[PDB]
A paper describes a structure:
ATP13A2, which is mutated in juvenile-onset Parkinson’s disease and autosomal recessive spastic paraplegia 78, is a transporter with a critical role in balancing the polyamine concentration between the lysosome and the cytosol. The overall structure of hATP13A2 has a canonical P-type ATPase architecture, with the cytosolic A domain linking to TM1 and TM2 domains, and the N and P domains sitting on the TM4 and TM5. The P-type ATPases transport substrates by coupling ATP hydrolysis with protein phosphorylation states and adopting a series of intermediate states, consisting of E1, E1-ATP, E1P-ADP, E1P, E2P, E2-Pi, and E2, in a process known as the Post-Albers reaction. Here, we report seven cryo-EM structures of hATP13A2 in six intermediate states, importantly including the putative E2 and E1-like states, thereby providing a nearly complete atomic-level conformational cycle spanning the Post-Albers reaction process.
Adenine nucleotides (AMP-PCP or ADP) or phosphate analogs (BeF3− or AlF4−) were used to stabilize hATP13A2 in the E1-ATP or E1P/E2P intermediate states. However, in the structures obtained after incubation with BeF3− and AlF4−, no significant difference was observed. By comparing with known E2P structures, we suggest that both BeF3− and AlF4− incubated structures are in the same E2P state. Accordingly, we found a polyamine entrance binding pocket positioned in the endo-/lysosomal luminal leaflet with an outward-opening architecture in the E2P structure of hATP13A2. Spatially, the entrance site (denoted as Site1) located among TM1, TM2, TM4a, TM5, and TM6, had a chalk-shaped architecture open to the luminal side where substrates were captured. The chalk-shaped EM density, in conjunction with the results of a liquid chromatography-tandem mass spectrometry (LC-MS/MS) experiment, suggested the presence of a linear endogenous spermine (SPM) substrate. There are also several negatively charged residues, such as D254, E456, and D960, located near the entrance to the chalk-shaped pocket, which may be important for the recruitment of positively charged polyamines into Site1. The gating feature of Site1 was further supported by all-atom explicit solvent MD simulations of hATP13A2 in the E2P state, which revealed that, despite being deeply buried in the membrane bilayer, Site1 could be hydrated. In E2P state, conformational rearrangements in the cytosolic domains and transmembrane regions induce the opening of the entrance pocket Site1, and the negatively charged amino acids are enabled to recruit positively charged polyamines (shown in green). The low pH environment of the lysosome may favor the recruitment of polyamines from the luminal side to the negatively charged entrance Site1 in the E2P state.
Author numbering: 36 to 107, 163 to 416, 420 to 560, 572 to 585, 611 to 790, 820 to 1169
């Protein structure tokens, strides 16, 4: 979208120093609204002529950053892209002027190289072509990524807690908080360091010069417009260059997955110089391995570099990764608003209570601050981390070496997973199916089967045909051959010599000679068309075009073979004289070679299990459409009235054609690029039912992932390595199943190449999310009940014992908050998903329901003691209010502890998708021990309340009533928690519509209305 620029470098060196010195404290409110902050300090409004400080306007692009330029030609760095200053009309553009030179192609064709006349300025403007992530902020993570406000509030509460004694509690909470924040810095920095090491290329590449000068220069000094020479052996390509002469052969192993070599461009011209937007074969991609290059009539092969930098395929992924994105983070505003609106009256209420008792003005405010800080606890991230560590440790047991505590629960409610077919949907390496290289005319279907089981010259012909596919062909047949071969058992054969590949014509002729029993002959292979048209006098083509179309329609690779018997003397003469034209012209059709692209047998059960839980399975790959549809039919997950489409980028007006094979559609790269613009009127109608995404460039994968995230979807794209690097961070779940190459950084990293891990990782994420939600609910309820307990304790104007409270808090943190998250998911596959977004009726129908019960059970116990002959504690007369061990405080503390115990016991729920309740034996024994010690703290008259100062009372009849009340509460809490499991009233009221959002459901229901 459009963006405006403005200039305001400086006015004068005046009050700016004082402003900078003053603004050191209020930076917390200064950071928000940068535009107002920079406009309130200085504003030298003028035209952009020599302005260093620029501000991005908020006219259409609703964001803001900071920019700093350097004077060397005015330029700066902004998300990798560099802007070029032009004085012709005083405006800023990108590096697209010289590249888009669609005029006077003669000078482009005459580019042969430069030495020293046009290098300094080019190096000054373009600069280094290397890719490096800066590590400037090595200290500065504290000031960069720690400007959230669970840390400012934590620091504010630290001083308030340090005002009192609070030794052990503060010592524990600071030690806990300083470890996670220190480990996060190392975790963040290791990713950047390994990315910097992985993205590096420093090698010496020769550059030809006019006049006959050759020397070795580094790859750092490389600018567009120069000529690069290609060595015969072939190395790596550091920049996106283009061939100008000769013929070369390369494979797009890291660009499209398949290692299928493709012919290069041609010498004839007539169009523009490069035309990268309208040319695909002519464009030579970089970052790929070169197998072999062919020379020409010239002295050597030369290449021309027309564009390099972050705009190429290598830099596109890097730019996509370091770009900011447009749950688990929007659910805190409601909670903080609720606590604020619940505690606004609490402060004034407590002030009113304190004002009645004539509280001194010394500790009047510390009590209010403690009350404010007690209804919100600084341990929620700690609880989340300690709940997550168990799942993280269990995940690593199955060979999954991933570190992402905050990403485990994100992918719990996965809706669809984007698969890829290069190594994760098909067995690595090309295997041999039933091959039957029969004769030509008078053919019969006979008979696809494992090779070399029958006997005959075909076995020897296939064995002698050779040059990662040759090794597999030799090994996967059973008969081991490279100079001599036995276990025929009869009529042994051996090879003597072979001929190299010829790039001009696809021919592979191998000469064999066995003078023992049979006669020597020659075997050749090549394209089926060549052997069909070159064998007319011997094998006339009869009914040959009917099977070729069917074989090619399935994406199978077909290569034919041929042979011609010859006498011994000419055969040996041809073998020794290194000739090839003496055997061509008249041969006999040997047959054809057929390959198979079948998927792994274990993938089908996983696909079937994934399709019965209303989870979509989309296919994303860069192969041809025929291979994609063949793989889809082979998997057989679904195919109701499959429809095929073809690009129509020929006229401004266009229409989608209708062709034959609750429906699915196939989309391609150019098809997706043409259907967009307009996006909102053509993409939503096809992005829901489409399931085929073949023949798409890797750069479009990032755009597709970004667009899918805006539709409230849950992407589950899994990478393989060196194929999809940019589409790994903006997605929800990213799993790498190979050590090379994108496995250095990923949301999930595993050492397994099977799809069976997806269901178990999904179940683990769901269980972790459920445990985290339960823990958060328990902590919120405990905070609320502590708040009301403290509020009701202000009637007598007393304070709880610091030692007992500290001990009980430590016990709760080390016993309940730890062993609670030990539950795991069962070995079953559920239908529904754990529902988050705790702002609905079924989730909010328990908070107040438990709160009213707690308030009633506290009020009854507090008001029941009025019928007992006890003396009034010293509270209104002269006494020490710091410590008052009276009966009321003791009974209130006992009731609060019992409430904590019952909440910790009855916090559990159902959801049988996880492990059953009677499984966590350590949790059960810990609860039993807690109950036993709680009973013994007040039952036995033994010496235990000495340092506790509990004021033990010789009570005889009140203990029975207390036990009856606690048993009634125990039998009531379970009933309250179990009667609300059903949601029949929820569906009795919400009909027919139930959701006020998620427009995808509305689209689905309006689409199924007419079908
Ligand atoms: F088939 Be791939 F690796 F996109
Ligand atoms: Mg792959």
């Amino acid at each position: 979208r459009l963006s405006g620029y403005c200039g305001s470098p400086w006015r004068v060196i005046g009050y700016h120093v004082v402003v900078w010195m003053m603004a050191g404290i209020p930076l917390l409110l200064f950071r928000w609204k940068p535009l107002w902050g920079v406009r309130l300090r200085l504003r030298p409004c003028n035209l952009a002529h020599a302005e260093t400080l620029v501000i991005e306007i908020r006219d259409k692009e609703d964001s803001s950053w900071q920019l700093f330029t350097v004077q060397v030609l005015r330029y700066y760095l902004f998300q990798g892209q560099r802007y070029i200053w032009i004085e012709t009309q005083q405006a800023f553009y990108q590096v697209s002027l010289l590249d888009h030179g669609r005029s006077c192609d003669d000078v482009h064709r005459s580019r042969h190289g430069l030495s020293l006349q046009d290098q300094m300025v080019r190096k000054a403007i373009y600069g280094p072509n290397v890719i490096s992530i800066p590590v400037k902020s090595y200290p500065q993570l504290l000031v960069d990524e720690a400007l959230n406000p669970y840390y400012g509030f934590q620091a504010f509460s630290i001083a308030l807690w340090l005002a009192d004694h609070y030794y052990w509690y503060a010592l524990c909470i600071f030690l806990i908080s300083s470890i996670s924040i220190c480990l996060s810095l190392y975790k963040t920095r290791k990713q950047s360091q390994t990315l910097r090491d992985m993205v590096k290329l420093s090698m010496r590449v020769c550059v030809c010069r006019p006049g006959g000068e050759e020397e070795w220069v580094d790859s750092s000094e490389l600018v567009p417009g120069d000529c690069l020479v290609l060595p015969q052996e072939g190395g790596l390509m550091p920049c996106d260059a283009a061939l100008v002469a000769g013929e070369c052969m390369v494979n797009e192993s890291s660009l499209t997955g398949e290692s299928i070599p493709v012919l290069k461009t041609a010498l004839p011209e007539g169009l523009g110089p490069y035309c990268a937007e309208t040319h695909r074969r002519h464009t030579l991609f970089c970052g790929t391995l070169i197998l072999q290059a062919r020379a020409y009539v010239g002295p050597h092969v030369l290449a021309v570099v027309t564009r390099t930098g972050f705009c190429t395929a290598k830099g596109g992924l890097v730019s996509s990764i370091l770009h900011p994105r447009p749950k688990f983070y929007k659910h805190s505003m409601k909670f903080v608003a609720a606590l604020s609106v619940l505690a606004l009256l609490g402060t004034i209420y407590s002030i009113f209570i304190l004002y009645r008792n004539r509280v001194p003005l010394n500790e009047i405010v510390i009590r209010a601050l403690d009350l404010v800080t007690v209804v919100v606890p600084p341990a929620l991230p700690a609880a989340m981390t300690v709940c997550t560590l168990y799942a993280q440790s269990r995940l690593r047991r199955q060979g999954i070496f991933c570190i992402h505590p905050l990403r485990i629960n994100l992918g719990g409610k996965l809706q669809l997973v984007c698969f890829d077919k290069t190594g994760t949907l098909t067995e690595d390496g090309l295997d041999v199916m039933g091959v039957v290289p029969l004769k030509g005319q008078a053919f019969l279907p006979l008979v696809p089967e494992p090779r070399r089981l029958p006997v005959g010259p075909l076995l020897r012909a296939l064995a002698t045909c050779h040059a990662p596919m040759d090794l597999k062909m030799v090994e996967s047949t059973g008969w081991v051959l490279q100079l001599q071969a036995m276990e025929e058992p009869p009529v042994p054969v051996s090879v003597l010599h072979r001929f190299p590949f010829s790039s001009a014509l696809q021919r592979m002729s191998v000469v064999v000679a066995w003078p023992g029993a049979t006669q020597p002959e020659a075997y050749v292979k090549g394209s089926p068309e060549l052997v069909a048209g070159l064998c007319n006098p011997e094998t006339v083509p009869t009914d040959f075009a009917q099977m070729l179309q069917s074989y090619t329609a399935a994406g199978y690779r077909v290569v034919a073979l041929a042979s011609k018997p010859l006498p011994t003397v000419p055969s040996l003469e041809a073998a020794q004289q290194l000739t090839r034209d003496t055997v061509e012209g008249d041969l006999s059709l040997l047959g054809l070679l057929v390959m198979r692209n079948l998927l792994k047998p274990q993938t089908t059960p996983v696909i079937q299990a994934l399709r019965r839980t209303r989870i979509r399975a989309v296919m994303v790959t860069g192969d041809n459409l025929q291979t994609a549809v063949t793989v889809a039919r082979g998997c057989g997950m679904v195919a109701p009235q499959e429809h095929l489409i073809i690009v129509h980028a020929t006229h401004p007006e266009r229409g989608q054609p209708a062709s034959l094979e609750s429906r699915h559609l196939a989309l391609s790269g150019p098809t997706f690029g043409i259907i967009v613009k307009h996006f909102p009127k053509l993409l939503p109608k096809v992005l829901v039912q489409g399931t085929v995404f073949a023949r798409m460039a890797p750069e479009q994968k990032t755009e597709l992932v970004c667009e899918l995230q805006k539709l409230q979807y849950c992407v589950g794209m899994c990478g393989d390595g060196a194929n999809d690097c940019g589409a790994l961070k903006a997605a929800d779940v990213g799993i790498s199943l190979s050590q090379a190459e994108a496995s250095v950084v990923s949301p999930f990293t595993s050492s397994m190449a099977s799809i069976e891990c997806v269901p178990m990782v999904i179940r683990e994420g769901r269980c972790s999310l459920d445990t985290s939600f339960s823990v958060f609910k328990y902590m919120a309820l405990y905070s609320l009940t502590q708040f009301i307990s403290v509020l009701i304790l202000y009637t007598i104007n007393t304070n709880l014992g610091d030692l007992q409270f500290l001990a009980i808090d430590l016990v709760i943190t080390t016993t309940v908050a730890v062993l609670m998250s030990r539950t795991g998911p069962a070995l079953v596959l559920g239908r529904v998903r754990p529902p988050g977004a705790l702002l609905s009726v079924p989730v909010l129908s328990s908070l107040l329901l438990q709160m009213v019960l707690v308030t009633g059970v506290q009020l009854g116990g507090y008001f029941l003691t009025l019928a007992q002959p006890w003396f009034v504690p010293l509270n209104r007369t002269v006494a020490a209010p710091d410590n008052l061990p009276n009966y009321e405080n003791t009974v209130v503390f006992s009731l609060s502890s019992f409430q904590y115990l019952i909440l910790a016991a009855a916090v559990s729920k159902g959801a049988p998708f996880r492990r059953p309740l009677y499984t966590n034996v350590p949790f059960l024994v810990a609860l039993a021990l807690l109950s036993s010690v709680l009973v013994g703290l007040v039952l036995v008259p033994g010496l235990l309340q000495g340092p506790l100062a509990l004021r033990n009372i010789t009570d005889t009849g009140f203990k029975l009533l207390l036990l009856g009340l606690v048993t009634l509460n125990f039998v009531g809490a379970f009933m309250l928690e179990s009667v609300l499991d059903q949601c029949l009233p929820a569906c009795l009221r919400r009909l027919r519509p139930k959701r006020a959002s998620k427009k995808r459901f509305k689209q689905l229901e309006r689409e199924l209305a007419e079908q």
